[PDB]
């Protein structure tokens, strides 16, 4: 049986070892798509979401030099429209598209069974050299990333209602 959902059956594709496993797949989506593809997709969504929630808070905390003079009022999604008129978004888009090109090659290598989901070998600082502490940081990455997806959706949608932006909406 399933851990998270006691009435429902254990998901077939999911395994205990797969980091951030709670036996949570009520609709059986893991049966439809390749499990490694879903794992890479979740890990990528986690990392983008983490950056976006941190960015939302940071935009309320401060503003880089000169940004106050391109955009005055807009805080969360309004800034994107002003910046697409400029080269700021196009530039992020071009460089991220370039990084994702090698992400596509990484995905192809993963889907043949060689590489591991989310593993780009990017560990410059010595944070994973134990393989027990490494397992804790992997699970912490997934849990913080899932929290960050829910948060980023939460913050952007709150801006859609109010226009306040995250932390200022907290204040008022």
């Amino acid at each position: 049986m399933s851990e998270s959902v006691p009435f429902l059956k254990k998901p077939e594709a999911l395994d205990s070892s797969m980091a951030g496993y709670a036996g949570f797949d009520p609709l059986g989506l893991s049966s439809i798509a390749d499990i490694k593809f879903l794992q890479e997709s979740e890990i990528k969504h986690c990392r983008i979401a983490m950056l976006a929630a941190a960015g939302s808070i940071a935009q309320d905390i401060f503003t880089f030099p000169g940004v106050s003079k391109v955009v005055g009022t807009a805080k969360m999604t309004g800034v994107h429209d002003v910046l697409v008129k400029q080269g700021a978004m196009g530039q992020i888009l071009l460089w991220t598209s370039f990084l994702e090109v090698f992400g596509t090659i990484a995905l192809l290598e993963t889907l043949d069974g060689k590489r591991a989901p989310g593993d780009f070998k990017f560990d410059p600082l010595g944070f994973s050299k134990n393989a027990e502490t490494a397992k804790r940081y992997q699970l912490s990455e997934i849990k913080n990333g899932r929290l960050a997806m829910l948060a980023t959706g939460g913050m952007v949608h709150g801006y859609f209602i109010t226009g306040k932006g995250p932390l200022e909406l907290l204040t008022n």
Partner: protein, 175 residues
């Protein structure tokens, strides 16, 4: 097994760290579809043209031959602001020197070390190991000169000044 430049991707099987410049950097699998001797001689030729072109563009603004219609500093505009016939003569020169240099060969026919066309009249490569070091120098400065010349010529399309002129007066106070 794993590429030096890209840790997560597997090493391109073809490279084997033999040619100079092999940091395992072939992610898009271009060596599987074409012969690497042709690719290396192409890389060297592109880098040599780009090195000459970067140096030329830089000096055009700083020093120009003192004749009428040779005084436009901006490289891009100097193409149009020049006798078409004279540049056309240079284009025809590029043809003969090439046919004679490569002994009159095609893609299969060219392969002889790749890029070793023999035009080294002075004896710089005395030590063969110094030759190998100079080859590493040639390929790395050629790669830098490809990106650098592309970057300045697109600056010149943007700024309209030339390399050193665009660098010295870059508009910090607007987009």
């Amino acid at each position: 097994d794993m590429s030096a430049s890209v840790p997560f991707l597997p090493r391109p099987a073809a490279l084997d760290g033999s040619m100079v410049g092999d940091v395992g950097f072939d992610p898009l699998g271009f060596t599987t579809k074409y012969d690497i001797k042709w690719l290396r001689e192409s890389e060297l030729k592109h880098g040599r043209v780009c090195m000459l072109a970067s140096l030329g563009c830089i000096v055009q603004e700083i020093v120009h031959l003192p004749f009428e219609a040779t005084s436009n500093p901006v490289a891009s505009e100097a193409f149009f602001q020049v006798p078409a016939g004279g540049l056309w003569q240079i284009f025809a020169g590029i043809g003969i020197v090439e046919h004679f240099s490569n002994n009159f060969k095609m893609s299969g026919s060219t392969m002889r070390a790749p890029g070793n066309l023999g035009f080294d009249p002075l004896n710089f490569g005395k030590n063969p190991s110094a030759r190998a070091r100079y080859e590493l120098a040639e390929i790395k400065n050629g790669r830098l000169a490809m990106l650098g010349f592309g970057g300045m010529i697109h600056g010149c399309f943007i700024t309209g000044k030339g390399p050193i002129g665009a660098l010295t007066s870059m508009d910090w106070h607007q987009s």
